[PDB]
């Protein structure tokens, strides 16, 4: 983009209903830092998401030490705040023709005075508002950097944001390795006798596992059963008689060995 928003007044671009491509943002070497908190930084492709908030502003370069969640600082307690249980990625890279320019860059402002601390994800709108002079034979962390915030929320909703992978035809009555919007797991799948409400996605048990999903492109509902297992037990006489054995499978019948 041509012009961004300030750390005083920032910009919130709500992003939904599109196919993401994080890898092209990952492999391109145009970034000073790439720190994904709560999610592994290369596993960005496989998990499918509900809502995306693109949050862009600019900052003093040493204050990328203070952009971390939980970390205190004059941007953290006054200007821009993350929760402690934040997940997502913050990406910052240098700006020496990008946001650095002459005229100062006094379009972008920072508030240094406030009489309290902040609520996370808040935009607040002596005189408390100032704008830096970007001069690096002082700090090269007194340079402005393009910082961006990719906040995520984990799956509890209709997921609509994920990457470039290709789906496949399903199957039934065979233990497979499934994947639904990022939910992995094993087991067997069958048709649902259970009627389903037209706003949910997930059947969860008492035992905190998933028994019922719906295909995110087909309104059929499937039941999840973990494919059968059992204890392995051996019947034998003593070794001082023979070496013939007897094999016993616990709690499952012989049609599946």
């Amino acid at each position, epitope marked *: 983009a041509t012009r961004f928003a300030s750390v005083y007044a920032w910009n919130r671009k709500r992003i939904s209903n599109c196919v993401a491509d994080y890898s092209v943002l990952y492999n391109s*070497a*145009s970034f000073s830092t790439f720190k994904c908190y709560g999610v592994s930084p290369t596993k960005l492709n496989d998990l499918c998401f509900t809502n995306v908030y693109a949050d862009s502003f600019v900052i003093r370069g040493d204050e990328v030490r203070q952009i971390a969640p939980g970390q205190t600082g004059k941007i953290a307690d006054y200007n821009y705040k993350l929760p402690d249980d934040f997940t997502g990625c913050v990406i910052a890279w*240098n700006s*020496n*023709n990008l946001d*650095s*320019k*002459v*005229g*100062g*860059n006094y379009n972008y402002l920072y508030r240094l005075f406030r009489k309290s601390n902040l609520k996370p994800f808040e935009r607040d709108i002596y005189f408390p508002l100032q704008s830096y*002079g*970007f*001069q*690096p*034979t002082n700090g*090269v962390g007194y*340079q402005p950097y393009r910082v961006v915030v990719l906040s995520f929320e984990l799956l509890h909703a209709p997921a609509t944001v994920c990457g470039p992978k290709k789906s496949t035809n399903l199957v039934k009555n065979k233990c497979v390795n499934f994947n639904f919007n990022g939910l992995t797991g094993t087991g067997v799948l069958t048709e649902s006798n259970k009627k389903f409400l037209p706003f949910q996605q997930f059947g969860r048990d008492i035992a905190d596992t998933t028994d019922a999903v719906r295909d995110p492109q087909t309104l059929e509902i499937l039941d999840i059963t973990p494919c059968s297992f059992g204890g392995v037990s051996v019947i034998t006489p003593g070794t001082n008689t023979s070496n013939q054995v007897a094999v016993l499978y616990q709690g499952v019948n012989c049609t599946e060995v």
Partner: antibody
Amino acid sequence: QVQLVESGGGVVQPGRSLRLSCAASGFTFSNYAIHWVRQAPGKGLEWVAVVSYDGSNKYYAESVKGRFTISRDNSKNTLSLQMISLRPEDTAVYYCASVADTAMVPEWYFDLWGRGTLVTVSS
Amino acid sequence: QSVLTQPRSVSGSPGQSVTISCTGTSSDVGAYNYVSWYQQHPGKAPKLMIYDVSARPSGVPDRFSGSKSGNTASLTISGLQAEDEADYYCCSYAGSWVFGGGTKLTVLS
């Protein structure tokens, strides 16, 4: 001291080639663009080229394309300007032109200048 | 267009004010706000004096000033001193760096 020292100048013949360079000191050379701006003796100013730190984005002038090639080395804080097919109108004092740190001046403007070297293309 | 139009020379009395035009095109001057002014002593490199026509960099005295409307920039130097006697160059960057024709300021002594 922010300082730019040109190298590679001399007196060459038309039809031959030459390679210039410029060493940087006093500033982080990897974070700001350097340019070549040429000036014939007693005449006006004329920009030549620009190189990026990743080595992908380069822009040349209209009397420059197809002959002159700029490159840089961010580790050694120097650069190069590979020049082939030299003509006598290219005879100019060549300046490696970048920006220092103390200024708010960006890299597309021209604050930090070099001392220059003379390239003569004559037979 | 190819070379920005400047007066070849501007003569002015010392201590007075002179105005030096930088006439370009709409694709060169009126497109963006990125117009510069460059003082070049003979036998030395150029030196920046004006960015973004309104303001000045660090170390530049307030005698240097600019005005732009449409497609013509106008460097204004009030209080001419003998150390301002050099070559003057204006440059614009919309997609490329286009310099000016050259202007020799002559401080009358």
